[model samples]
Target: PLPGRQSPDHARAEAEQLAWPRSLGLIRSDAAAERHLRGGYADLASRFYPHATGADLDLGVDLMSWHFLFDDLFDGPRGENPEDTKQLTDQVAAALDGPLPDTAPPIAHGFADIWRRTCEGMTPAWCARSARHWRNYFDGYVDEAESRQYLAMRRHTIGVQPTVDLAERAGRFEVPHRVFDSAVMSAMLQIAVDVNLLLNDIANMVMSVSHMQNEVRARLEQYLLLESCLPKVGEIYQLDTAEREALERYRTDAVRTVIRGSYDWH
Candidate 1:
């Protein structure tokens, strides 16, 4: 772990502080929370925000825990049924739009709480952008589930474009773009997305055979963006060269953490 980063034990403690399972009623007993903490969710959050500190780090853990729980819920028997998964995802999306009644699943309430927290300090434009991205993520999950089911039945390869688009959207590419107004920064942000997606694909390939070639092509685009595009953009925008370099280094560190952590988790 990097300097000032939480140790794995500390990260697990931070996630436990959120009390999401209790607040959202996801737990059957204290043992459930213990099981969740031991599931390596802290590992995910710790890697995802290797440099995050204080409340920011806590928030990362909270959401990652929520995400992992949701994945666990959806990626089993229900996930194998398209109709069942669609119904669940539809409810989840609806929860994002508005508060759910008490009768809703604990996970739905948990998601709603996350939605509220996520939108709290964000600009309206950013909030809308994030909501859209989240919906796209859910839609991608459905698309993937359906594709898997179809593949199982038909046993034919599907085009990679859908997977590519899903990766682009699910990776939250627009978040960085919204953070900085500079076109140069936005272009670099796209490169960051490419890097993230390629790294993710590579990590997934380690767990199971997948599109190694597409990931390689994506990585090449990222290299060009970093080597050729970023510096030129910095010059065009009259950015402080050193500051741009620092930002590049920061992103590189974060991405490396993600790749390594994802691989280890898988």
Candidate 2:
């Protein structure tokens, strides 16, 4: 009922393989890198990306590390300047296609590693798709920067659905699904996003205007329990009952896994 397998050993094993401290050292100092490794972010990723294995797991760990470091860099007072953020994001976007600069920051260096490794065996179409998603993820920082300034102008209020929508996209799950894009799939993705951000908002004590936190939490639990959303998702992909149930398990378990991971992290 909780979720998929909780594999701390698998997570730790993958983390060891990533040599996170050394890889992250490309951007962070040995000390800083060690400190972050101790934070167990790779372990958290293992929980979220439960199906990942081998190099997939390694990349998942690295991405979690990179995302956390990037968020820390720009989510604080340091990222308040839109111009400064623009410059940093520009460097990163360029690193995606062009050569890494001699003076690139750790984020750029780390991202380059992620980009190169991720593209290694992917098809052209998949590569392009991922690139677009990655760019959107990067561009999301601009929105954050603007929102910070805009809110400052208006004394810092937040909009629920808009903020959740952006947070969902910005969260950038990066895992590709089997079904083609459709209304049901989009709705399911939105539900995942809403669950993710709503939980985050509650943890951060950020007020959400659209609905009560308790109400949303109850709905999320119910959705997973009844497997209510899975039929629509499964139907879109033409999955039979057995296959649909399997897919249902996968999707619902992942949602619960993230919720569990978020809860434990909090």
Candidate 3:
């Protein structure tokens, strides 16, 4: 269920847990990434989202997260330091989230076009054909001895990426002198948690479906069209891998980490 539609008890548990303490950066792989996360968080927190800077801030992160998941799950690399996100943030910022618009900016549409070009030729039916194709494609890093590594990567995707994205978003908005004061930034942080939780639940529910892959692929096709790219098999699978566990975790508990940063304020 979407976070808004979640049970009070369930949502409260998630919200409270997200308030737990954690690092301020998104991926936190190194000093540079952390520094950028801090700067970005402050920059957006200080602004109104064009209409609502908060909205853009959240959108920027969520949108970036989704696309990041798309790339990672499909076996796209982990992304270059600032370059991937810079473009992702811009693409998301320009997307529409209200009545006047029902989609992202022209550039986002262009990205969708690119996505389709990358994927259009791959039929989703191949999924039911054989696990070998998928294994080779989704788990490219696997040597016979490293098949388990593939699983490890999957776990990393499900258990890790979402929180990183959420935390990164929170971290990006954290400085006191930046746009959002602690309290306001906290609220935006919560939005990340709620949105991710909603998405996580959706993922879990979808996993229950027999036709889930095809359904998701169809959606991917459209999504690719939206981004302007080819919807190749590799991309689709990587997208899945990206969203798998990490997305669930992000939706469930990522925001709490951000709220913890706010707690530090008091």
Candidate 4:
């Protein structure tokens, strides 16, 4: 039922402004820069983080900038280089460790700087957890696949989990782990986890498109059922008005937007 919205505040122009700097600043070739520019990360960012503004908006753009380039590394003949990709992930891992390195790859430098900015003023526990998430994402790349196997691997490689984690940052809130691990949010995320992205196989699930459709129906149905239960959450947790408002805002700005944004982006 949700709809997509663009940021009236600085989104279009600001996103445009970032393109040149990010494209050239990264280690990408001029040809790749041109390719990345055309694909345009901000367009996707605005869809996902449309409500975010000021420094939060800047955070979204830079992260998305890195995201675009990072994935680009795997696009062509480059994707075949698991060992090379593994080495780069190591540098990125070190970036998370603390100090920047001398042999710094652009991904490491950009990621380290962006991550540091992302961590400041946020929870230490959140940072540590998300640091592990970034590693999880990188491992999915080198681990390898089949379509069925690919779908399982696809779980991590799509980059859904961490980005959703940042939806907390973009909206400037956190889902207290207790609540996040419980209903509503977990169901919403699991629904996000379920959407299929394709192919044939030794035993193709594609053989039954109806099964996919029906499963989506169940997910949607369960979400609405969970949707009806938000009031109980505050009561159970004894949340005050301000706390309740934050949850409401999160539900709208992050949860709803992810669904709306991805559909609109596609």
Candidate 5:
């Protein structure tokens, strides 16, 4: 409903009645917090380096770029857009900027710099072209709208947007496994947590199917809306009441089935 659909007094009164008068309590204990933080530090330290003492020699630096390269099954352009991919790159830079060792792997330079230094280099023109391709992927038909919207809603979504840089349809890595040089499986899990990509994938799949369902329902609803608007049209056109009744019943049942079948999450 519109915010001011009711008079001020009525709306205020309703809101006042509905308002909760309680506070939520803290859910975690300090020990739990320490355990989580310590675990994370230990794991990250172990994963990146064996830890530094007098410094014998460091393990290979874990370097990662932003976004997955697509094979181009995606409806739009394929490959990394340095500008668009910069968000991912900056995030890693932020992490590296915080309390880490000089002995640890080098920090995350944005994708363009990484690509320029690494992948035969990238130019501003190249970055712009790639960025345009990612833009097309952002709203492409093959990638699915909810998936696209989720990416647009969160910057992570950009990596997974459908691309058409090649013949195969593919998306940016919603779960940026390929972005870094960590264990692919570990990176996948990390990215899943970072972006809620795993859960969103399930939701997006359902939403895609739901889009088709809504289209069918929309047609049925439109016909129902039309019939309700002019009940006597059928009679005027010499159609039998039985035919109208059966058709209406069928629509009602279809709507009921749809509502009953998939409306709730639990």
Candidate 6:
């Protein structure tokens, strides 16, 4: 299961308490390798996996933390050629196989360790999908054209694809590619990505900041729609109990963790 339904283990404040210290711990050990002394990571990760345990929070933090570093690792001190950019990121790509044969670069070693942990019960097929998503993120560095064209690449470069993939990793389940590729899932994921791509669009147009000064009916309405007949999706797909749970976890977590989590992180 992605996670059993549990109230957040650490209150939001307590999670923030650990975010920076833990973020520092990863790189200090030479796992992520940078000394920026940043905080707010764990809190963001906690929101991403709100129902996750302290242990699961550990995994979530590593990924969000690593991604933060990984992006900066290539943000162009001198702006390397796109050809050269491929090589730098590919150095880490091999790490998905496991730790390097012997000694390795700092970022490379960190990713290898994270990959091992993230793969807990996931299939190698999913690992490849995860790997391929990383490749897409890497490749997104090179692109240009129409608006939709750029957004397609923007969707990847902005980190939406892997974020969606890893909600399963963090949640602890896999939607078999067949179901994962469904029109239902595809539309759901697209809505997520576009939401990630927007802020003012959802807010500025035809929106209300508060329902009634202090509280309103708008908030609760959103979630009931979520709870309504989730298992019906199960019925339509004939999902095995195993797949059913994972799908449930993903859809549920996606809104809060993937959607709100990313919103909060920014």
Best by lDDT: 4
TM-score of each: 0.66, 0.71, 0.21, 0.82, 0.21, 0.71
What clash count does candidate 3 reach?
50
Error of 1 at 215 (Å): 4.9
**How does each model score on lDDT?**
0.54, 0.56, 0.31, 0.67, 0.28, 0.60
Q: After superposition, how far is residue 74 of candidate 5 from its true place, in Å?
A: 25
Task: Give the root-mean-square deviation of each candidate in angstroms.
Answer: 7.1, 6.3, 22.2, 3.8, 23.7, 6.7
Among these predictions, the greatest TM-score belongs to 4
Which of the two candidates, 4 or 5, achieves a greater TM-score against the reference? 4
In candidate 5, stretches whose alpha carbon ends up further than 4 angstroms from where it belongs are 1-114, 117-123, 129-151, 154-158, 161-200, 203-266
Per-residue lDDT for 82-187 in model 1, tens only? 7788788888788767878777787888878767766666456756756776776677667666755122221111112212222222233222332245565444
Give the candidates in order of lDDT, highest first: 4, 6, 2, 1, 3, 5
Better of 3 and 4 by lDDT: 4
Q: On residues 1-266, what C-alpha lDDT tens digit does candidate 6 reach at each position? A: 12333226645434444354344343455333334335455566677777666666677766767777677765554124565555656677777655585455666666777777777788988988888887777666543111112356667766777766766777677775776767656655665665565532333223344433122133334344544555675677788878787777777775445666665555
State the lDDT of candidate 5 residue by residue for 73-98, as single tens digits.
13343223434334333343333224
**Collision pairs in model 6:** 2-171
lDDT of 4 by residue, 46-149 (tens): 76777787677667767777776777777765467777667767777787788976578767788887788777777888788778888888788776422213
lDDT comparing candidate 1 with the true structure: 0.54
TM-score of 6: 0.71
lDDT of 2 by residue, 124-159 (tens): 565565666666666667666775612222211121
- The reply for model 6, stretches above 4 Å from the true place, is 1-7, 10-39, 78-80, 101-103, 142-149, 199-233
Better of 1 and 4 by TM-score: 4
Among all windows of 10 consecutive residues in model 4, the one with the lowest summed lDDT is 196-205
Query: What is the Cα-based lDDT of residue 264 in candidate 1?
Result: 49
